C-alpha cells in the first residue's frame with residue numbers, strides 16, 4: 380500500500396499529540412490544511428484515511444462506491460452492537476439486513492401515504508401538547524423527541540407511546556445521553572483508546588449503561604411479540620423479522636436470527652428518533668435567531684397551505700423558501716460532521732494512493748456541507764445557499780447530510796418527510812418566542828464530535 384501523506388505518529392497513541400479531542404473536526408481540518416484534502420491520521424492505534432471537501436468525498440463514496448461500501452468503527456456503538464445489526468456491520472450481513480429493512484419499512488408505508496398519514500396525526504398530537512403549555516417557557520427537547528420517536532415506533536413496535544409513559548421518557552433520555560457522549564471530548568478520546576477506556580470509570584460507562592438499557596427494552600418487546608405472533612399478519616417490523624427468521628430456520632448460514640433482530644430494530648428506533656429530533660431542536664434555535672427568516676416562512680405557509688388544512692408533503696413543491704430554510708438548517712446543523720466511518724473492502728487505488736483491504740475511511744460530511752466552492756457563507760445561517768436569483772429552490776451537490784454512495788441513509792425519505800411536515804405544521808400554528816433577544820442567542824454548537832449538538836435553550840410557543 381501507498382497511503383496518503385500525514386503527520387508522523389507515536390506508538391499506540393498515534394497522532395494524539397496533534398489532535399484536539401474537544402473538536403476533532405477542526406483538528407482534522409487544521410491537518411488537512413497542510414497535507415491535502417486526502418490524508419492519513421492515526422486515532423490511537425487506528426489508521427484512518429480522511430477525506431475533505433465535496434470532491435474527495437464524492438470521488439470515493441460515489442465514483443468508487445462498491446470499494447468504499449465497507450463500514451469502519453464507531454467505538455461507542457460498537458461496544459453494544461459488536462458487528463451485528465444493519466448499521467454497524469459489514470459484508471453479507473449488512474447487505475441482507477439492509478435489503479430487508481428497506482423492503483419492510485416500505486411495506487409499512489414509508490415513502491407513501493400510510494406514513495405521511497401517521498406523521499400528520501402525530502404532528503397533530505404535538506400541536507395539542509405545545510398548545511397545552513399555554514405559551515409557558517419550556518425546553519422543547521422531549522416534546523420534539525416524543526413526537527419524532529412515535530413515527531418510527533409505530534413501525535417497529537406497532538403503536539405509538541403515550542406522551543406521558545415514563546419508560547418512554549426514560550428511553551428517550553438514554554438515546555439523547557449516549558448520542559451526546561459521542562460528541563464530547565471524552566467520547567472522542569474513546570474513539571482512540573476504547574480498548575483501555577471501556578474498562579475505566581468515566582462518562583463512557585454511563586453511555587454504555589444507556590445503550591444496554593435500550594437493548595434490554597428491545598429484547599423485552601421482541602419476546603412479547605414472539606408469543607403473540609401471527610405469521611400471516613405482521614403487525615410491525617419485529618413481526619416481519621420474526622416471520623423471516625421462521626422461514627430461515629432451516630438455513631444455518633442465515634443472517635436472520637435474534638441478535639440481528641434486536642440490533643437492527645435498535646438501529647431504526649435510535650436513528651429514527653435522535654437525528655430528526657436533534658435537527659428540529661437546532662432548527663428552532665436558528666429560527667428564533669433569525670426572526671426575519673421565520674417570518675418569510677410563515678408568509679409562504681399562510682399563502683400556499685393556508686391557516687386551515689394540515690400541511691402535506693406534496694406542498695413542498697410550491698414552497699421553495701421553506702425547503703431552502705430546512706436544507707440550510709440541515710447544512711448548518713451538520714449532524715454527523717466526520718460522517719459515519721467507512722472502510723475499503725479490498726485493495727483500492729484511489730487518486731495517487733493505494734489503500735489496502737480494511738483501511739478505515741472518514742468521509743467528512745461536515746467539510747462537504749461547508750465547502751467554500753459550493754457555499755458562499757459556509758459558517759453562517761443563510762437560506763439563500765438554496766435559492767436562485769429568481770427565488771426558486773436550488774439543489775447543491777454538496778448537500779450531503781444523509782451521505783452518499785452505497786451506505787447512504789435509507790431512512791432519508793422518511794426524514795425529509797418528517798422534517799418538512801413537523802416544521803411546516805408547527806409553524807402553521809405558532810410563532811417562536813425566545814426569552815433572549817436574537818443578538819444574544821448562541822447558535823454555535825455545544826459539542827462537536829461524532830455528532831454536532833445544539834446548546835440548551837428554552838422557548839415559548841405562542842399562537843399566530
Ligand code: HEM
Nearest residue numbers: 465466650651654655658719780781782786787788790794
Ligand atoms: C435528520 C435525519 C437523518 C440524518 C441527517 C441521517 C444521516 C445518516 C448518515 C450520515 C448515515 C451514515 C451513512 C454512511 O454510512 O455513509 C446514516 C445511516 C443510517 N441511517 Fe440515517 N439519518 C437521518 C435519519 C434516519 C432515519 C429517520 C432512520 C430510520 C429509518 C435512519 C436510519 C439509518 C440507518 C439504519 C443507517 C445505516 C445504513 C447502513 O449502514 O447501510 N436515519 N444516516
Ligand SMILES: c1ccc2[nH]ccc2c1
Nearest residue numbers: 456466645646647649650
Ligand atoms: C446513526 C445512524 C444509525 C444508527 N443506529 C443506531 C444509532 C444510529 C445513529
